[PDB]
Amino acid sequence: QSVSRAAITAAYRRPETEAVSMLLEQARLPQPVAEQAHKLAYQLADKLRNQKNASGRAGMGVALMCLAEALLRIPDKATRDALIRKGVDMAMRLMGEQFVTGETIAEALANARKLEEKGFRYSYDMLGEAALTAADAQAYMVSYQQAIHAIGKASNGRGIYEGPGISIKLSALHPRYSRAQYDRVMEELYPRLKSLTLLARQYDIGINIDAEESDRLEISLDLLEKLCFEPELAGWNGIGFVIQAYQKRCPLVIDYLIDLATRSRRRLMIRLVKGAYWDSEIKRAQMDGLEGYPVYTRKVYTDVSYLACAKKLLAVPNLIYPQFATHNAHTLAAIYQLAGQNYYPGQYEFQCLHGMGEPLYEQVTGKVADGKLNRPCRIYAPVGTHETLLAYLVRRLLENGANTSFVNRIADTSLPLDELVADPVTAVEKLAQQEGQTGLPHPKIPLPRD
Ligand SMILES: Cc1cc2nc3c(=O)[nH]c(=O)nc-3n(C[C@H](O)[C@H](O)[C@H](O)COP(=O)(O)OP(=O)(O)OCC3O[C@@H](n4cnc5c(N)ncnc54)[C@H](O)[C@@H]3O)c2cc1C
């Protein structure tokens, strides 16, 4: 192939200067909006950093204090005045517990009410991916079915927007997905995806297809195309799909999705993320020695891409329900402003990961009279035991520990607020003036062929 599909293919690995130049004007926040976004980003990050007054306390050595502390334990003011495989496994479960909502779906479901009382929603993810055998893919299949029954019963008719949903990894459903051929995926994967989706629809819950490595995008689009034309799903708008802004294809994937919503007569739930597999995407392309990278090489270019993609998603409310997944205070503020005045609940929502977003979003989800923005947030809730945790944890470690990540830089008390919430288009123009060209690749990440 279709016009919109050909254009996805043609953009696969297009040069970074070219990709970033085309996004720039689509992501530029109009002056007045840009400053409202700066103001709100600044506030959100301020409150975050300075939760228990962590910067005002910073506005006031250690030897002296223990002396002052022991002096204050003297009850009387006068008296005082006058005077390898097991270590990896262990560290994994220790660092990973904060990211897991529970070990079983029922345990996770029972923890749901507290944040749901306040206006949060949930998307449960049964941990596990990259099934190696037929048996593994079967076991994931049954665990997903069980999760739907349990989530659907707790949803109890609340529907796709207000009630809980499920997220699924296609790699969990087909053995050796990473290398599987088109025909075997259709004959074997598709009937399982179709079946879980019919179940989700019987309970009227959202069912989201997660995005994984970039070599898998094309086939996920093929599976999506078919799923949207199932007669049993006609008139149901609960199908969701994740797109990754770090990909050069992302905008073209959107033009495709918009067309698919039109032809299949539905509103798609589209989760926009920046993307979780960047380190592997870079290694992978470097080992193939291909013409270029399928993802951006500077983080700021991903930020620009997200913004451009976000405007595109917000322009077609009849065709897409955007779900903006981020922990970045600027990103959130920009979307908030970009979405225009006259918010209505079903216009869009925010999303975050369990163990990462709560502090940002306690300022966002809830009543205005309590100082919140009154915008719903859906928490993505990993569910499983220690045997299914590893790949997810490692992705969380790369995200949290990267010096370009917002969650890492918010901690960095040396970096001031204004630099943290800086507008990314303005950052790209600043780089462009300094280097002589817009959208040059990362200096330390040369093209695979060098
Ligand atoms: C509800 C939810 C569901 C999710 N499900 C998925 C999913 O299905 N698929 C998936 O891939 N991710 C998924 N994620 C993970 C998500 O992609 C990461 O949390 C997200 O990228 C972190 O972005 P941020 O805006 O919070 O942080 P920011 O710190 O503002 O941006 C972080 C990032 O920018 C990108 N980046 C880092 N360095 C570079 C660089 N040198 N060049 C270009 N880009 C760079 C990476 O995407 C990295 O994650 C999900 C996240 C949420 C909240």
The token pair that represents 81 in the structure block: 């005045």
Query: Are 75 and 156 in a shared domain?
Result: no
Resolution in A: 2.3
| Residue 15 to residue 151: CA distance in whole angstroms | 44
State in Å: Cα 324 to ligand 1 middle: 11
State in Å: Cα 273 to ligand 1 middle: 6
Query: Which ligand 1 atom sits closest to the C-alpha of 242?
Result: 8
Query: Are 404 and 414 in a shared domain?
Result: yes
Query: Are 249 and 398 in a shared domain?
Result: yes
**Identity of residue 379:** I
CATH of the domain at 65: 1.20.5.460
Query: Which ligand 1 atom sits closest to the C-alpha of 327?
Result: 26
Mutate to test the pocket of ligand 1, among 295, 302, 358 (most ligand atoms within 8 A of CB): 302
Count of the separate structural domains present in the chain:
2
Query: Are 78 and 188 in a shared domain?
Result: no
CA 312 to chain centre: 18
State in Å: Cα 272 to ligand 1 middle: 9
Query: Which ligand 1 atom sits closest to the C-alpha of 442?
Result: 41
Residues flanking ligand 1, CB < 6 Å? 210-211, 242, 244, 246, 273-278, 295-299, 301-302, 325-328, 331, 351-353, 380, 399, 404-406, 442
State in Å: Cα 121 to ligand 1 middle: 20
Query: Are 359 and 448 in a shared domain?
Result: yes
| Residue 216 to residue 381: CA distance in whole angstroms | 23
State in Å: Cα 244 to ligand 1 middle: 8
Residue 123 pairs in a beta bridge with 165, 380
Query: Which ligand 1 atom sits closest to the C-alpha of 399?
Result: 49
Query: Which ligand 1 atom sits closest to the C-alpha of 407?
Result: 29
Query: Are 326 and 435 in a shared domain?
Result: yes
Atom 36 of ligand 1: nearest residue by CA position = 299
| Residue 309 to residue 422: CA distance in whole angstroms | 19
Mutate to test the pocket of ligand 1, among 273, 383, 395 (most ligand atoms within 8 A of CB): 273
State in Å: Cα 328 to ligand 1 middle: 10
β strands within 150-296, DSSP E: 165-168, 207-209, 239-244, 268-273
- CA count, 13 A, side-chain hemisphere, 350: 30
Q: Is 398 helix (H, G, I), strand (E, B) or coil?
A: helix
Q: Are 209 and 168 in contact (CB under 8 A)?
A: yes
Atom 44 of ligand 1: nearest residue by CA position = 299
Query: Are 1 and 75 in a shared domain?
Result: no
State in Å: Cα 407 to ligand 1 middle: 11
State in Å: Cα 148 to ligand 1 middle: 26
Q: Looking at 49, 83, 117, which one is the last position of a domain?
A: 83
State in Å: Cα 405 to ligand 1 middle: 9
Q: Solved how?
A: X-ray
- CA count, 13 A, side-chain hemisphere, 51: 9
Mutate to test the pocket of ligand 1, among 249, 253, 274 (most ligand atoms within 8 A of CB): 274
The kind and range of the H/E element at 353 are strand 349-353
Sign of CA dihedral 258, 262, 263, 267: positive
State in Å: Cα 299 to ligand 1 middle: 10
User: Which CA distances in Å does 249 have to 255, 296, 305?
Assistant: 10, 11, 10
Query: Are 78 and 90 in a shared domain?
Result: no
State in Å: Cα 212 to ligand 1 middle: 12
| Residue 326 to residue 357: CA distance in whole angstroms | 8
State phi, psi for 166 to the nearest 5 degrees: -125, 145
State phi, psi for 148 to the nearest 5 degrees: -60, -50
Atom 32 of ligand 1: nearest residue by CA position = 405
Q: Are 205 and 167 in contact (CB under 8 A)?
A: no
CATH of the domain at 154: 3.20.20.220
| Residue 428 to residue 246: CA distance in whole angstroms | 15
Identify the domain containing residue 289 by its residue range. 1-59+84-450
Q: Are 20 and 248 in contact (CB under 8 A)?
A: no
Sign of CA dihedral 170, 176, 178, 184: negative
State phi, psi for 267 to the nearest 5 degrees: -105, 120
Atom 17 of ligand 1: nearest residue by CA position = 275
Q: Looking at 51, 83, 115, which one is the last position of a domain?
A: 83
**Identity of residue 3:** V
Q: What is the full DSSP assignment across 193-209?
A: HHHHHHHHHHTT--EEE
Buried b (16+ CB within 10 A) or exposed e, 209-248: bbbbbbebbebbbebbeebbeeeebeebbbbbbbbbbbbb
Q: Are 11 and 252 in contact (CB under 8 A)?
A: yes
| Residue 318 to residue 346: CA distance in whole angstroms | 10
Query: Are 320 and 419 in a shared domain?
Result: yes
Angle between the N-to-C axes of helices 31-49 and 329-338, in degrees from 0 to 180, rounded to the nearest 10 = 140
Q: What is the full DSSP assignment across 142-153?
A: HHHHHHHHHHHH
Name the residue among 404, 423, 215 with its Cα closest to residue 306. Answer: 423
The C-alpha angle 380, 385, 389, rounded to 5 degrees, equals: 60
Query: Are 240 and 121 in a shared domain?
Result: yes
Query: Are 211 and 264 in a shared domain?
Result: yes
Query: Are 436 and 410 in a shared domain?
Result: yes
State in Å: Cα 274 to ligand 1 middle: 4
Atom 51 of ligand 1: nearest residue by CA position = 325
